[PDB]
Structure formats: C-alpha cells, structure tokens
Amino acid sequence: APQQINDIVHRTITPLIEQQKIPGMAVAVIYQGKPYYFTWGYADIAKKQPVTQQTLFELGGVSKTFTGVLGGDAIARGEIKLSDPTTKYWPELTAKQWNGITLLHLATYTAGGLPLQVPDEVKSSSDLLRFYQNWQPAWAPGTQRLYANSSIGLFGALAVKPSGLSFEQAMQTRVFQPLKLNHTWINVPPAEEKNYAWGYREGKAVHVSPGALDAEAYGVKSTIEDMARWVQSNLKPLDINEKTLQQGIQLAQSRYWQTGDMYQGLGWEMLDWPVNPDSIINGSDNKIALAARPVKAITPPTPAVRASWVHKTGATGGFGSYVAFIPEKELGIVMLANKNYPNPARVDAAWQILNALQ
Numbered sequence: 001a002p003q004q005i006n007d008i009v010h011r012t013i014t015p016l017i018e019q020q021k022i023p024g025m026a027v028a029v030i031y032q033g034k035p036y037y038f039t040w041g042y043a044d045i046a047k048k049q050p051v052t053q054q055t056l057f058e059l060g061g062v063s064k065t066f067t068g069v070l071g072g073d074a075i076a077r078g079e080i081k082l083s084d085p086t087t088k089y090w091p092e093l094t095a096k097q098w099n100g101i102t103l104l105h106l107a108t109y110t111a112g113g114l115p116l117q118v119p120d121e122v123k124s125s126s127d128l129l130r131f132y133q134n135w136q137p138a139w140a141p142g143t144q145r146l147y148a149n150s151s152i153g154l155f156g157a158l159a160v161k162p163s164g165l166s167f168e169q170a171m172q173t174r175v176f177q178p179l180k181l182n183h184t185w186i187n188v189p190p191a192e193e194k195n196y197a198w199g200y201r202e203g204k205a206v207h208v209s210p211g212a213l214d215a216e217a218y219g220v221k222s223t224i225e226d227m228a229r230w231v232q233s234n235l236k237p238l239d240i241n242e243k244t245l246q247q248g249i250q251l252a253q254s255r256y257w258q259t260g261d262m263y264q265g266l267g268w269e270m271l272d273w274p275v276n277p278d279s280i281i282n283g284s285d286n287k288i289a290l291a292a293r294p295v296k297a298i299t300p301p302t303p304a305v306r307a308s309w310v311h312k313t314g315a316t317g318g319f320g321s322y323v324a325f326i327p328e329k330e331l332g333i334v335m336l337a338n339k340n341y342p343n344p345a346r347v348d349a350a351w352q353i354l355n356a357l358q
C-alpha cells in the first residue's frame, strides 16, 4: 500500500465521509494490476458491524455495466445482433411505435423516451408487455438519450432469450463465474446475509425492493474485492481467457453515440482522457430527475478507446456507488457507500484520486 496511494485516498475520502455523513464506505484503487483496499465505518449501525472487504453493497445502476457486458457476450456468441429489431425477441410488441426500435436503441437509452422507471404496478411479464405496448414515444428512435431502467432493462431481458437461460443464470455462468466474482449476487443467499450491509435513507436501514427488470437494471450486490476484479477485467480484457466474454467487454466500451463530451457504451459511459473534471464531475448529477439530450450517431461505432475515462454511477434508496477507470493508465477506482449521496461528490473524489496517480 504505497504511502502515496494511502495518503491521496485518505485525504480525499475522510473529508467526503464527514461532509456527506456516510455511515460506511469501501474503496478500491487498482494501480498497475494490483488492488489496494480501504474501509471505513459501519455496514450495520445498530449491530455495530464494520465495513470489511467482504461487505456486500447494492450497486444500483452500476449493475448496468454487467448487463451491457453480458449483452456484449451474447453478441460475440452470434446469439443476437444490436441491429436486430426488438420485435424479433418479443413478437407480441405489435404496437406501431416498435417498428424501427432496435436492441442498440434499448441498450443505449435511445429508443425514443422510454421512462426511467418501470411502473410499480407492473408485476408480471403480461403487465410488462402492456406497459411497453401502451408507451408512447416522445421521439423517433436514435435521436435523443434519456437514461432509463425500462430501456436497458428490456435489452437485458431480450438479449439472453436465445441462450435459453434466465437472465440470472446467464449472468452467473457467462460473467460472474468466468471472472471469479464469487461474492457478487443478483439474489443474496441466506448464507451471505451476515455480510449484507444495510443502506441508510434518512437514518433508516433499508434494502432495495423487488421490482420488474430489477436484476437487469439496478439489482446487483457485490463486495469491494469483486468490484475491483470487475474493474481490472474491464481495464484489461485481453487477459480474459473466455473469447466471447473478452469480446463482449470490448463491445460494451465501444462508442455508439455522443452527447456533449460523453459517449455512450453498453452500460459504460466514456469521455476522452484527459478530461476536464468539470465536464465529468458536473456531468454526473441526479439532482436532475429527467435530462433529455440530443445524440449524434457514431457511424460506425468507435472501438474501445484506451485513452478514456470510462465510468458509471449507481444508486438505490440507501446506497451510492461509483466506478471509473482509465485503460491507458492501467488505473481504476471503485467507491461503495451505504448512503446515496450526491453524484458530483463521487466524481470529484474519484478524479482527485486518479489524477494524483497519473
């Protein structure tokens, strides 16, 4: 644990925890292929259980990076194509607005305004079909980006049907197991509950509630060790032995669309490095509930750029997560907290840390 890394991480995170009143936090810095872990506070305040390297945190939207890579793996296997129409995988979506919407649109939030959330009244696949059939796009496909669980969530659900596996089984067998993410879960087993941190919202202990397409959009729980391995796998996909997975990881970091200085991948989002911190820090901000932005197509998509700031923020009611890495510098960071705090503070801290290390 280089004193440099230790100091940079502690001088940045200690103040963060104090200002945001975060009960528990785990951080991992990946530098030149080696992970350095740091933990603070509590996983369960009432039971005085500390955060450890085995503590499970709710990833929120960081889960979309796993969905994007699993999709990328299915593409590499020849099971699906992003140019495929959505109806190929759900023929029952007969409403006229679905002609023209492809798996690429679903995966990149460009289908035309699918909503951020699937309504809580949706409790079955029949309800889900009704929801999508009744949805009225605001825009033509491929014209504007609107971040949405109902978009990438449907992509995840459709992408695995050719495999014959359920989304969870596909994720476990094609991504978690090959990468040795053995303490990463869509459903936390009873044996692992002792390590499942409580999230805190307004001082109350909370866990994410079950919902339609939750696994696909915001339902993964993981430890700081597994997340560091996830970041390393995305930093250096050539070291991965499973061919289609290696390719899938690379596909998720392709640049499909541009809005401002940001590029949309499958799950992952990217900016050219070096990046103005005010374009990424101020860039990530959920203080805004709906931010519709025109997108420019990258025709054809740019293959994964090593000189990139690749990242993803995530939140649930009681957790706040952030992952960012720079392939060209073999540098990455994971920050997991059991309080959902402002996105800009997460980005500012990660930038201060990675910038200091190169």
Ligand SMILES: CC(=O)OCC1=C(C(=O)O)N2C(=O)[C@@H](NC(=O)Cc3cccs3)[C@H]2SC1
Pocket: 059, 060, 061, 062, 116, 117, 147, 148, 149, 208, 209, 211, 218, 285, 286, 288, 289, 290, 313, 314, 315, 316, 317
């Ligand atoms: C739309 C937007 O930019 O706002 C930030 C956001 C994020 C994020 O990237 O931090 N997302 C997540 O991490 C998801 N979170 C949830 O869906 C929260 C829950 C839905 C149901 C129970 S918790 C979405 S909720 C929306």
Ligand SMILES: *CC1=C(C(=O)O)N[C@H]([C@H](NC(=O)Cc2cccs2)C(=O)O)SC1
Pocket: 089, 090, 122, 123, 124, 125, 128, 157, 158, 211, 212, 213
């Ligand atoms: C395409 C598609 C289908 C289908 O072709 O019938 N069904 C999916 C279904 N999902 C669920 O049963 C779980 C849900 C509960 C609430 C919302 S979905 C499945 O298991 O394949 S949905 C996509």
